[PDB]
Amino acid sequence: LWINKPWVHSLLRICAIISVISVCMNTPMTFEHYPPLQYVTFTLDTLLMFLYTAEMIAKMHIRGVKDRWCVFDGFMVFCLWVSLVLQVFEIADIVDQMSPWGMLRIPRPLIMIRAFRIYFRFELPRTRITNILKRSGEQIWSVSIFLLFFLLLYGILGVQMFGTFTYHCVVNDTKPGNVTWNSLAIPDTHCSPELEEGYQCPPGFKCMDLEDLGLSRQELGYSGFNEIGTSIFTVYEAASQEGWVFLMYRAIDSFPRWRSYFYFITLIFFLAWLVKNVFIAVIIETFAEIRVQFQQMWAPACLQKMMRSSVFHMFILSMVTVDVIVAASNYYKGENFRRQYDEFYLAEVAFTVLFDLEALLKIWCLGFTGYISSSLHKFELLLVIGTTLHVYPDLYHSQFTYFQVLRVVRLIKISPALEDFVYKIFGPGKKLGSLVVFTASLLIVMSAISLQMFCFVEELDRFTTFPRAFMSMFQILTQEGWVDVMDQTLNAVGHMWAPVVAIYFILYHLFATLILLSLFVAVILDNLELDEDLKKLKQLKQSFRNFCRVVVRARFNNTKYHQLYDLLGLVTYLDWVMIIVTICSCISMMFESPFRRVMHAPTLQIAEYVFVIFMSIELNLKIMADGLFFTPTAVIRDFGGVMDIFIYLVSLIFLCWMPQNVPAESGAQLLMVLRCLRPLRIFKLVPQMRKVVRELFSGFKEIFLVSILLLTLMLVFASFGVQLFAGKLAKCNDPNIIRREDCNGIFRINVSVSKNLNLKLRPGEKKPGFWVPRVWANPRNFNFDNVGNAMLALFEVLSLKGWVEVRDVIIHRVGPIHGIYIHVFVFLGCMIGLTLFVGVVIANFNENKGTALLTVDQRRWEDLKSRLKIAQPLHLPPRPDNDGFRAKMYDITQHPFFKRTIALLVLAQSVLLSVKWDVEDPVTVPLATMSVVFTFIFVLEVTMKIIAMSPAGFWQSRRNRYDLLVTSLGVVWVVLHFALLNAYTYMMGACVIVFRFFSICGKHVTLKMLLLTVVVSMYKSFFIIVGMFLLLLCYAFAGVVLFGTVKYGENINRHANFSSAGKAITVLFRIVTGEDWNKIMHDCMVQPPFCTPDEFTYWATDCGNYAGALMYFCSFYVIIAYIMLNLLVAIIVENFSLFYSTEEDQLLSYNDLRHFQIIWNMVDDKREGVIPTFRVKFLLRLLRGRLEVDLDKDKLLFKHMCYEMERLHNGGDVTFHDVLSMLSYRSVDIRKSLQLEELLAREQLEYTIEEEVAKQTIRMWLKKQSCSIIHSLRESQQ
Amino acid sequence: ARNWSRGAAGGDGQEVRSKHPTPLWNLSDFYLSFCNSYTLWELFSGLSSPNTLNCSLDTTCRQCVEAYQDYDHHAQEKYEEFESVLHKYLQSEEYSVKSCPEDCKIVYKAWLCSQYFEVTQFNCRKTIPCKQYCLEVQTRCPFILPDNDEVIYGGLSSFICTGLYETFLTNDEPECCDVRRE
Ligand SMILES: *[C@@H]1O[C@H](CO)[C@@H](O[C@@H]2O[C@H](CO)[C@@H](O[C@@H]3O[C@H](CO)[C@@H](O)[C@H](O)[C@@H]3O)[C@H](O)[C@H]2NC(C)=O)[C@H](O)[C@H]1NC(C)=O
Ligand SMILES: *[C@@H]1O[C@H](CO)[C@@H](O[C@@H]2O[C@H](CO)[C@@H](O)[C@H](O)[C@H]2NC(C)=O)[C@H](O)[C@H]1NC(C)=O
Ligand SMILES: *[C@@H]1O[C@H](CO)[C@@H](O)[C@H](O)[C@H]1NC(C)=O
Ligand SMILES: *[C@@H]1O[C@H](CO)[C@@H](O)[C@H](O)[C@H]1NC(C)=O
């Protein structure tokens, strides 16, 4: 049974991995590095191929079309044969290794799939699996259309608001045909050619479009707004949060300020934050569907004391902490190292001997067979063996050092709370283990495909060998410089192939960033919930001073005015005054500067007095009314009362001092920093922001435990990094010097003009540069010489900003194998570790609103119950019959093709914004003329509706009201355009086309639900966004006083600095998106001799503050990026399951609701919205389809439905919502959909209806299809 | 007598603008043509590759005057490349509160001259160890970013004079003169 034996089946899956490893070594560069690879890969491919062809013939010829795996195997043996036929030519004189024929090796790596073969009956039936997969596929397709709408919207806007970024400042000596690196400014910069419309170059310089000076598109670069094709590409790269601030600064220099500030900030808020959270919500609802489907589918005797005692456990734990701090403490110190037999090695051998003795005592006292069965003891054996190897003289400080630093893992037994949290969040290893394995297998297959696609270019590096390709694909996955990886390929592969590689990188980046990262979020959230049976069990089992008091507690002041009275009644009159004087004080502080302080300017000091004069009266009144802390109504209730009296004290102390000079590192400088806390009292005064702060701090214990895990990860990689890298990672400034004995004298250094704008040199020309001393130095942003420097470098790497600079510098200056350190830390910390905060914040948010305790069935029911409350009957009037003309116009305007041709015409008009609508280019005249023709077509379509139905009925629909308004603006633009022919009429033409382009979100049903999801999420998140802005003000005011005079540096420049509160706010928004915050921090850390100190005045010196920058930046990035922004994810995840809906035979769907609306709107003709009970028996006969109550067979359901509505109002009449809520309760499995409180009330009502209908059917004798499926279940149970 | 200041002879001293007019004489004070703080006295007292002191005053080894004029010329050519880079640095009016590009090009000129002539200076009232001009440049000049191509410069500027805790200003004190306005 050659085929059938299980012993060959394991071999035939393991050897698939070897067939991937061989094709990862077929490359011209790895063959010229290692010639024997070309011979061993051929024989290793040949004898492998025999095994796969041997099963392929035997399974068809002896044991044997429709089986997908049989045709897959057949295609894969053909891939091996054509690979061998190519290789036996390429090794001969036939063809070389740099030929493009190697592209016939790109389908081979897909044999990675055979190695697994785990695709049959994984706990669930096929049909049940395909129901999950199709349901998630339609959700993903819906969000892809939604994304494409946004990408095209910002595309047509970018074309119209911005154009070509080609007006660089140039030294005038440049003639048209000689543009070179020496003709540019050194801090390379754009201008506006129009005066006052942007930046303009200083004397001795001028600006002109470098493309007209003979530069080509690949020399300028691909990023610009010249057409919708390039504009959609720049919109995508900007929406990825990768170099978006550089596009913003280029736009600020070339064009007006306001349009750049509006466009790029709103692009980030929508397309980066709010839209990506919808892809996260779709994958979370996919995990919710899975639980639905899983839930629905069903001497030696001292061993007794010495091993157990708290003394022995605490002694080993303190010896482990002592060993770890001793091991990490070996900082640089100097250039003297003697590591064959030295200090820090004797300690390590002594502690290694102690842990050997500990392990052997446990093994003796417990017995080896009883010891080895524990998972902790298996791990401690691995460390006891690995550190016994590490402390051998030839292996000390080698790659065995991981077994040394992993000793800190044992320390987790310190508190049961951290153990329980670890076991909770990582959960059953099977969920996270399969996802990290899938992530690795995907990345390995994709790097093998990119390798065989690009390795022969010979003008492109980074794809020449498998490790280079792997680093390139991993860099694209991690979101860092991914666009630079793509551009390096685009400018090397050539213009004929640039579109093909562009869509390849875009498709990989889409999947790797939208699906893979959201799967980690969904897995960690699914672990943080209870199991559905455990929450079911929990639910089942749980069942004159009185004048001052009157002054303090002052009284407050249809529906439109009631909402205003509610607002006015929000706080006491005194707290409204305190909100007002706090806000005017922050507005005064907005005008402060290092060159304009309140201490020297009475105009700003007026607000400083008013704040203290009002707040002293406030605190005195509240103290005289209710006391300090002696009663539950007193003023010092909690931290809010403590914060306000502290703010009052620092404010009063500053106002009575007003120090006329202030040194840069002084108590007066600290008091001026503490004065910037005033915006914080607005959180206390406004009760919605008190709620936001208390709901945020509900998670503090969980957030703290995640911080302890991340600090533990940073500490082991820092300890390893100090032991491996101290004194290395340092070299000469001169690229041509390889030894420290040669780092003397001076050399010519080449200055950075720009990393973009890739010009070629003329054959004899030098780059711009000057003469400089050569020295042996660390990099200025990370040095790896002590634990503090190592942990600071790892904290910066953890945020994924500059991590590529750290990677390349380790590879270059230490060695290639040390790449593993930085890649593993980025996977553990950035991919897994920071996702623990995302999970904890969203889980605690759902616990605050109580939905964490509900079953997925109950959550769906609650989201249906609100969706049916939001629902209304249709505004559409019935068709007229008094004349034939309005009757045929009603038919015509309702045809199912007419709706689609009108939707297509909106896209057809939107395409006229493909290129800038200026006034000088004659192509503007056809485009504007065509928009007039479209405008008349839409005037006619509005007329067809106005003659199909009454104008009074037409105007009830919001869509009709909006499309009428846009069409009125259209015909107004048409007459104005022909009257004036000016640039403002072309601008108004572009505006009305953009206004009409938004109409398609009212016509496509899934696009409407996704737009509503985002629009309501902006309303829901308002106080969270205001809370973040109050923190931006506190940090901006602190940054102006702390860094306002800092000398320009790596990133601190004219575009980014703290010279005013406005410039501080835009610099903080850069840091919120994360764009190079650490380069800026290292500029703000500057001290002598890089800056000029002053003895007693902070506005005189241009130095920074070292400890100030470390506290100011790290705190800002943690509280905003790791914590606050994750509430905006929770808000989108809340609203997506509410507003989005799909077809599902468990609930009342939007198809059922539309069918019910159409049938309601033929019984309620007069549109009163409330029907007499006499017509309910008629209404529930017309409901054919999935709502069908059959008159026959289902007579008891018919009588129930009639009697329920007749009982509800004791006859009379019935609203739309009462019939609709009867339909929902009569079409769900109430025994799992309802909560245990409302379930008893329903069942009691329905039992009363059973008794009454039984009484009526007795009395009338004595005198002489989801609804019916659910009725059958109920009748069967009762 | 005075520092070079302004004028070809009014300061009771001149510059060696020509090779041949100094075969003999008696008092050494002729200043250079670009590195104006250095006279022939401290130059011949220092180190010259072709020949040394005394054979100068005795014609026979005058070839050293042309060697100093050649060094003075190379020091000027390297200075031009710096001040054209500084001219093309468009943020020279705003990068610092106390610094000015005038101060920068003074202290960088003094640094280039102390690189080409490592000789001591004296009798100018104001003296300073020549290694201080590295710290003047790193304090008073712009942050110019080097071209990351082969070497990745991880945030360091083009001009720096110290690394890995090496000793500096170690009392070697090559006495230079304080040739700066502030
Ligand atoms: C091209 O670059 C050069 C370098 O600046 C610019 O030439 C400069 O032109 C201005 C205006 O003429 C000169 O200022 C004044 O010059 C006049 C005589 O030309 C003189 O009477 C004044 O005292 C004053 O110096 C400036 O000196 C001159 N630059 C040089 C080399 O001296 C030229 O104009 C640039 N092109 C542009 C865009 O202007
Ligand atoms: C500064 O840039 C110059 C280019 O002007 C570099 O000189 C090149 O060095 C490479 C060495 O890899 C040679 O192959 C090129 O031929 C050189 N170019 C020319 C025009 O000769 C130089 O290496 C750079 N130096 C520094 C210090 O950055
Ligand atoms: C300008 O370009 C021409 C070639 O088109 C070249 O011959 C000439 O030398 C160039 N002039 C300068 C100053 O570079
Ligand atoms: C005159 O000659 C003597 C010879 O020793 C020399 O030392 C002295 O410097 C000369 N005079 C002047 C003014 O230099």
CSV table of N, CA and C in Angstrom, one decimal, chain A residues 391-426:
chain,number,residue,atom,x,y,z
A,391,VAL,N,27.9,29.8,29.7
A,391,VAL,CA,29.0,30.2,30.5
A,391,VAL,C,30.3,29.4,30.2
A,392,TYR,N,30.3,28.6,29.2
A,392,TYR,CA,31.6,28.0,28.6
A,392,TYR,C,32.4,29.2,27.9
A,393,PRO,N,33.7,29.3,28.0
A,393,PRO,CA,34.5,30.5,27.6
A,393,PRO,C,34.3,30.9,26.1
A,394,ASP,N,34.1,29.9,25.2
A,394,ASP,CA,33.9,30.2,23.8
A,394,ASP,C,32.5,30.7,23.4
A,395,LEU,N,31.5,30.5,24.3
A,395,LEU,CA,30.1,30.8,24.1
A,395,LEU,C,29.6,32.0,25.0
A,396,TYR,N,30.5,32.6,25.9
A,396,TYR,CA,30.1,33.7,26.7
A,396,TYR,C,29.8,35.0,25.8
A,397,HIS,N,28.7,35.7,26.2
A,397,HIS,CA,28.1,36.8,25.4
A,397,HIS,C,27.9,36.5,23.9
A,398,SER,N,27.6,35.2,23.5
A,398,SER,CA,27.2,34.8,22.2
A,398,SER,C,25.7,34.8,22.1
A,399,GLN,N,25.1,34.3,21.0
A,399,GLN,CA,23.6,34.1,20.8
A,399,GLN,C,23.0,33.2,21.9
A,400,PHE,N,23.8,32.4,22.7
A,400,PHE,CA,23.3,31.7,23.9
A,400,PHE,C,22.9,32.7,25.0
A,401,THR,N,23.2,34.0,24.9
A,401,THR,CA,22.8,35.0,26.0
A,401,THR,C,21.3,35.1,26.2
A,402,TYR,N,20.5,34.7,25.3
A,402,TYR,CA,19.0,34.6,25.5
A,402,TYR,C,18.7,33.8,26.7
A,403,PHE,N,19.3,32.6,26.9
A,403,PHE,CA,19.0,31.7,28.0
A,403,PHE,C,19.4,32.4,29.3
A,404,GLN,N,20.4,33.3,29.3
A,404,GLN,CA,20.8,34.1,30.5
A,404,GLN,C,19.6,35.1,30.8
A,405,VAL,N,19.2,36.0,29.9
A,405,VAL,CA,18.3,37.0,30.2
A,405,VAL,C,16.9,36.5,30.4
A,406,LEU,N,16.5,35.4,29.8
A,406,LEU,CA,15.2,34.7,30.1
A,406,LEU,C,15.0,34.2,31.5
A,407,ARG,N,16.0,34.3,32.4
A,407,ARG,CA,15.9,34.0,33.8
A,407,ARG,C,14.8,34.9,34.5
A,408,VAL,N,14.6,36.1,34.0
A,408,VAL,CA,13.6,37.1,34.6
A,408,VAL,C,12.2,36.5,34.5
A,409,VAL,N,12.0,35.6,33.6
A,409,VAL,CA,10.6,35.0,33.4
A,409,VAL,C,10.2,34.3,34.7
A,410,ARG,N,11.1,33.7,35.4
A,410,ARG,CA,10.6,32.9,36.5
A,410,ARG,C,10.0,33.8,37.6
A,411,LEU,N,10.3,35.1,37.5
A,411,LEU,CA,9.9,36.0,38.6
A,411,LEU,C,8.4,36.3,38.5
A,412,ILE,N,7.7,35.7,37.5
A,412,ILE,CA,6.3,36.1,37.4
A,412,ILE,C,5.5,35.5,38.6
A,413,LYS,N,6.0,34.5,39.3
A,413,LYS,CA,5.3,33.9,40.5
A,413,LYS,C,5.2,34.9,41.7
A,414,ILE,N,5.7,36.1,41.5
A,414,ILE,CA,5.7,37.1,42.6
A,414,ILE,C,4.3,37.4,43.1
A,415,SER,N,3.3,37.5,42.2
A,415,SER,CA,1.9,37.8,42.5
A,415,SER,C,1.0,37.0,41.7
A,416,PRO,N,0.0,36.2,42.3
A,416,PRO,CA,-1.0,35.5,41.5
A,416,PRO,C,-1.8,36.3,40.5
A,417,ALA,N,-2.0,37.6,40.7
A,417,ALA,CA,-2.7,38.5,39.9
A,417,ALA,C,-2.1,38.6,38.5
A,418,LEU,N,-0.7,38.7,38.4
A,418,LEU,CA,0.0,38.8,37.1
A,418,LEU,C,-0.1,37.5,36.3
A,419,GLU,N,0.1,36.3,37.1
A,419,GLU,CA,-0.1,35.0,36.5
A,419,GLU,C,-1.5,34.8,35.9
A,420,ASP,N,-2.6,35.1,36.6
A,420,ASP,CA,-3.9,35.0,36.2
A,420,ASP,C,-4.2,36.0,35.0
A,421,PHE,N,-3.7,37.2,35.0
A,421,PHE,CA,-3.8,38.1,33.8
A,421,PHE,C,-3.1,37.6,32.6
A,422,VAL,N,-1.9,37.0,32.7
A,422,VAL,CA,-1.2,36.4,31.6
A,422,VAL,C,-2.0,35.2,31.0
A,423,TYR,N,-2.4,34.3,31.9
A,423,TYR,CA,-3.2,33.1,31.4
A,423,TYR,C,-4.6,33.6,30.8
A,424,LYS,N,-5.2,34.6,31.3
A,424,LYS,CA,-6.4,35.2,30.7
A,424,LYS,C,-6.2,35.8,29.3
A,425,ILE,N,-5.2,36.7,29.1
A,425,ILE,CA,-5.0,37.5,27.9
A,425,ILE,C,-4.4,36.6,26.7
A,426,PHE,N,-3.5,35.7,27.0
A,426,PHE,CA,-2.9,34.8,26.0
A,426,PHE,C,-3.8,33.6,25.8
